[PDB]
Design a protein around this ligand. Structure first.
Ligand code: HEM
Ligand code: HEM
Ligand SMILES: Cc1ccnc(CCCCCO[C@H]2CNC[C@H]2Cc2cc(C)cc(N)n2)c1
Ligand SMILES: Cc1ccnc(CCCCCO[C@H]2CNC[C@H]2Cc2cc(C)cc(N)n2)c1
Ligand SMILES: C[C@H](O)[C@H](O)[C@H]1CNc2nc(N)[nH]c(=O)c2N1
Ligand SMILES: C[C@H](O)[C@H](O)[C@H]1CNc2nc(N)[nH]c(=O)c2N1
Ligand SMILES: [Zn+2]
Lengths: 411, 407
């Protein structure tokens, strides 16, 4: 079967066949769409088909499908599964698999970049100290003094589900949040609960507005351990505005390195529960969401007060006005310090070229419109006007429950 | 089977049960989401009639009463004998209000129970259609104090006698492709303008020419009528700070009046059912003015503001966008023509969703349409999970009449 998508600005129509390779389920049915819902231990029996389907894809991609090497590898994996209940990926398969999980991530606007990903194989790691070292090397490499390079570090896969590797941080670099007795929050409200865990685990909190959190790292199902990232490895950008000289005195800064650490990477039915990955920011992530969400730094009012905007009626668009100036400030600041960042115009235009290329060479590009459209100025970006199809391909990144909810404390 | 929706700003979780009463199909499957796609007999009729009459009688707390049973009987008898049936006035009004209540793409549904219904089922000719539509236009406009209204022409019979308003909205501007290669006016209406010209309209050939109505009665060939100019309330666009803004020569009409949809009530199909409310400011300022395939004015405005248009990263487009939208709202407000900004409208919709969840067990909503086309995440709907599903009575898209009509 063929599915068509239309761009309503260009009338360009594309045809999807790749959706036929999807088997995992969406949340939707013929009677309900769950497109805006945020969140909508394996047998031998289920594992070999998953391994086979992955190795078939890998061997096709290298133009060796049905070769002796392909068949010998299926045979070798089959025997390893029957003998040991699992199997190990070759380094080449791991690299391919991690690049493909990114290529297949339908909520990611930055996928034009998917084939340039540095993969750090950390499957020989055994302790939380070893994980700390691996993560430092990833941060230093990816940062590259501001010229950011995408990278992922892949710790040992799940075995019985009782020996998982996990990074408890949701991203490698994040700012502490502290709920005050008077109900206000100091620092980032998104990280209050994780900050509390850190403190209980014995972190000495500086209690400021931008305290970089310590890593909490679990190796081999053991209780997690605290480590502080060397501050010299944490690149930060003070935020200022090209015209408004009072903007700097808001005291805002942000970190350069966005590095998601709470997702699970599935390749060939194997589960990598600790696979931190990093790219670079699109400016709206910081300027729109991190600064302006009501439940985050929530700076809209203070900025609009300083701009002397008419704040008595929402219809003056004061919030929209302040929003744009904050976002100019973020892009200006990153650019002035030579830290990689991309604006939402450039990123979405590149995504559309990526998507057309995918349709032409791969037969499709699963994309989640709800997430791809930027959180400001939606319809003046080309993605707003682009019909998209969302479906689930493996290899994939997946959500997983936060580890403090599931961990069995050894004590 | 019982579904939860969460707001990620407030942590409020609501439980949806209303979706189980859902009838039509979404276009999604378990394998593929099509959430972003813009367009995804006597025997058939009585179940549809019964489903509707049951909900109606339920709504007036008379479910299972003799009057309920008697009406179901009357309607069964009428379909068996005539192949169709007629709605009572009370039913028609309930149906129309509920079609709006059910419109998953409409942010303005807090208003759904205040809808003036004009019953034009007695209409027989296109001149009649024109008269009904002028009265709707004048009633709804109410000298700038807009009032929601729908006018309902006769229902489909054998499908060869359809009433249709050929126009996509009662009030729209002409578009003309020029020797230049550019487009004069609204590029969204080029094809329809050509049809008008073909049918005999003398086009003034300007940037903002109000199109004539093309009305089809009883499946006859459509006829042209110009809406009295004095009934079309328009607003010149100016900016409260930028003196030069007025010289762009921009204006928009005050009354948004969708005329191309099909209203389905109790299985009956009302193919001409123009309805109107009032504008959310972004509809004009973001979409009508700034879409590349619409009036596409961003460049011209940015230039008048003397922004750095060298690099996308200076956010020149974003700056100009906010200003264009400030001007739209200020102009409508100064001239006292009802308008709502996207902040106030989405705040109201969240309140309406809570009402619907508490009082009805849910609210079908299409997030892709509900979130405004600028400043998405600074409106509360962005952080609200929504479930989209199709309830009847409903408004539905239908084929453009010119592809369907035989002359
Ligand atoms: C290289 C520059 C990149 C840019 C500009 C970028 C951009 C983005 C943005 C804006 C989002 C939405 C984030 C949000 O709203 O919180 C996102 C989501 C995501 N991206 Fe990327 N991305 C990049 C690289 C990467 C890399 C290297 C990977 C993995 C190898 C990745 C995988 C993902 C995944 C799995 C999501 C979904 C995250 C979630 O559900 O929490 N991206 N991307
Ligand atoms: C009273 C003020 C109203 C407001 C502020 C409002 C708001 C809106 C907005 C912003 C849209 C999206 C339009 C677009 O993006 O092109 C919309 C769509 C829609 N509304 Fe409303 N609305 C109002 C009244 C009504 C009424 C009175 C009805 C029916 C009686 C209605 C039914 C619909 C339907 C069916 C759609 C989807 C239209 C389509 O798919 O083309 N609305 N509404
Ligand atoms: C590699 C890269 C490049 C550019 N940006 C990034 C940062 C992405 C961070 C995502 C942060 O999102 C936070 C805030 N809201 C939901 C949460 C992420 C999330 C939450 C849930 C429940 C599910 C899910 N899939 N994803 C990473
Ligand atoms: C009553 C009211 C209140 C506020 N605004 C309005 C105006 C809505 C007009 C809708 C016109 O929009 C045009 C351009 N994009 C979608 C399209 C309407 C539409 C188009 C298509 C192809 C399908 C569909 N269901 N609906 C009406
Ligand atoms: C409820 C809704 O799906 C939620 O707020 C989503 C919307 N779109 C998003 N888009 C991105 N890129 N990131 C997000 O966190 C969200 N949040
Ligand atoms: C492809 C995509 O669905 C299309 O551009 C949509 C997005 N959201 C929209 N939202 C509204 N309110 N109106 C629209 O016309 C659209 N267009
Ligand atoms: Zn869906």
């Amino acid at each position: 079967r063929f599915l068509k998508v239309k761009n309503w600005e260009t009338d360009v129509v594309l045809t999807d066949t790749l959706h036929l390779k999807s088997t995992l389920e969406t949340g939707c049915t013929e009677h309900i769409c769950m497109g805006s819902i945020v969140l909508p231990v394996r047998t031998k029996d289920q594992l070999f088909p998953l391994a086979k389907e992955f190795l078939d894809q890998y061997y096709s991609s290298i133009k060796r499908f049905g070769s002796k090497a392909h068949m010998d590898r299926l045979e070798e994996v089959n025997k390893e599964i029957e003998s040991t209940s699992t199997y190990q990926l070759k380094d080449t398969e791991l690299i391919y698999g991690a690049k493909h999980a990114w290529r297949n991530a339908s909520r990611c606007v930055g996928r034009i970049q998917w084939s340039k990903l540095q993969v750090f194989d950390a499957r020989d790691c055994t302790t939380a100290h070893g994980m700390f070292n691996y993560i430092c090397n990833h941060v230093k490499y990816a940062t590259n003094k501001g010229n950011l390079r995408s990278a992922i570090t892949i710790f040992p896969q799940r075995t019985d589900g009782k020996h998982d590797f996990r990074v408890w941080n949701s991203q490698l670099i994040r700012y502490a949040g502290y709920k005050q007795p008077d109900g206000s929050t100091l620092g980032d409200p998104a990280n209050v609960q994780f900050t509390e865990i850190c403190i209980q685990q014995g972190w000495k909190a500086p209690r400021g507005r931008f305290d970089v959190l310590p890593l909490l790292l679990q190796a081999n199902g053991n209780d997690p351990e605290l480590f502080q990232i060397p501050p010299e490895l944490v690149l930060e950008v003070p935020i200022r505005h090209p015209k408004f000289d009072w903007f700097k005195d808001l005291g805002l800064k942000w970190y350069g390195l966005p590095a998601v650490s709470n997702m699970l990477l599935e390749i060939g039915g194997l589960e990598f529960s600790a696979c931190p990955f990093s790219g670079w920011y699109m400016g709206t992530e910081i300027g729109v969401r991190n600064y302006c969400d009501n439940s985050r730094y929530n700076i809209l009012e203070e900025v609009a007060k300083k701009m002397d905007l008419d704040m008595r009626k929402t219809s003056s668009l004061w919030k929209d006005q302040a929003l744009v100036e904050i976002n100019i400030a973020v892009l200006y600041s990153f650019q002035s310090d030579k830290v990689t960042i991309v604006d939402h115009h450039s990123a979405t235009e590149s995504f559309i070229k990526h998507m057309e290329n995918e349709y032409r060479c791969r037969g499709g590009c699963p994309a989640d419109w709800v997430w791809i459209v930027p959180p400001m100025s939606g319809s003046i970006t080309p993605v707003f006007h682009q019909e998209m199809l969302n479906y689930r391909l493996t290899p994939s990144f997946e959500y997983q429950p936060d580890p403090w909810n599931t961990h069995v404390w050894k004590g």
